[PDB]
Ligand binder design. Structure first.
Ligand SMILES: C[S@@+](CC[C@H](N)C(=O)[O-])C[C@H]1O[C@@H](n2cnc3c(N)ncnc32)[C@H](O)[C@@H]1O
Ligand SMILES: [Zn+2]
Ligand SMILES: [Zn+2]
Ligand SMILES: [Zn+2]
Length: 214
């Protein structure tokens, strides 16, 4: 699979404004340099907002700015996944709830995407897209990052979380459970993949596999 690598979303014909900014939290700055801020009941984190750095009381210690500062894990690797094409796995262990990577691509309207589905994406045997917000999709058929190669599983070890970052909705991949070196990342497409009849057979090999994707 060939594609165009990007470092941040390309906004084609829509603007996915969250319609709320993040607004100053009551977290305390730890005195220890190497101790992280905004972990617990960050007001922002509470509602899935990243802190704005012009106002976080924790400055460079805030850990609620992961998407903003592109704090992706460095240990990912692409590989051939039996009966699934290509996939992604981690090289070192990951921890429950740890931020992994942003899902990137072209941010398009409901209709634009339907149009792409007709005039280009018809003949495809792999699909690369995620729902964003209210008839807007992230289309990574052409552009994205390594997140486009993460396979579906009816029993996922990762999840897509919609975040509000500086007034804009974006999607980060987060671990659901602990994972050791060599584990393939998977998430559940059903909850997130746009529904315009992209029925495909599932091969996750989960004992209770739903059998289809969508
Ligand atoms: C977002 S891409 C993942 C990367 C893809 N395997 C590749 O080689 O480029 C999703 C496509 O991979 C395939 N796929 C992903 N997970 C699968 C699974 N659990 N079972 C069968 N096919 C899967 C499907 O064909 C789907 O359209
Ligand atoms: Zn905070
Ligand atoms: Zn903060
Ligand atoms: Zn399955």
């Amino acid at each position: 699979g060939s594609y165009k690598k990007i470092r941040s979303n390309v906004y084609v014909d829509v603007k996915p404004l969250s319609g709320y900014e993040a607004t100053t939290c009551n977290c305390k700055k730890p005195d220890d340099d190497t101790r992280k801020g905004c972990v617990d009941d960050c007001l922002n984190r509470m509602i899935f907002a990243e802190c704005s750095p012009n106002t976080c009381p924790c400055g460079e210690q805030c850990c609620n700015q992961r998407i903003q500062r592109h704090e992706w894990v460095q240990c990912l690797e692409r590989f051939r996944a039996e009966e699934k094409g290509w996939g992604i796995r981690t090289k070192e262990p990951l921890k429950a709830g740890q931020f992994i990577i942003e899902y990137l691509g072209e941010v398009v309207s409901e209709q634009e995407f339907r149009n792409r589905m007709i005039e280009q994406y018809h003949n495809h045997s792999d699909h690369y897209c995620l729902n964003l917000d209210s008839g807007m999709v992230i289309d990574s058929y052409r552009m994205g990052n390594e997140a486009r190669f993460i396979n579906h599983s009816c029993d996922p070890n990762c999840e897509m979380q919609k975040w509000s970052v500086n007034g804009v909705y974006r999607i980060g991949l987060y671990a659901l459970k602990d994972m050791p070196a060599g584990t393939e990342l998977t998430y559940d497409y059903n909850f997130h993949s746009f529904n315009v009849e992209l029925q495909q057979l599932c091969k996750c090999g989960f004992e209770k596999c739903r059998g289809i994707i969508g």
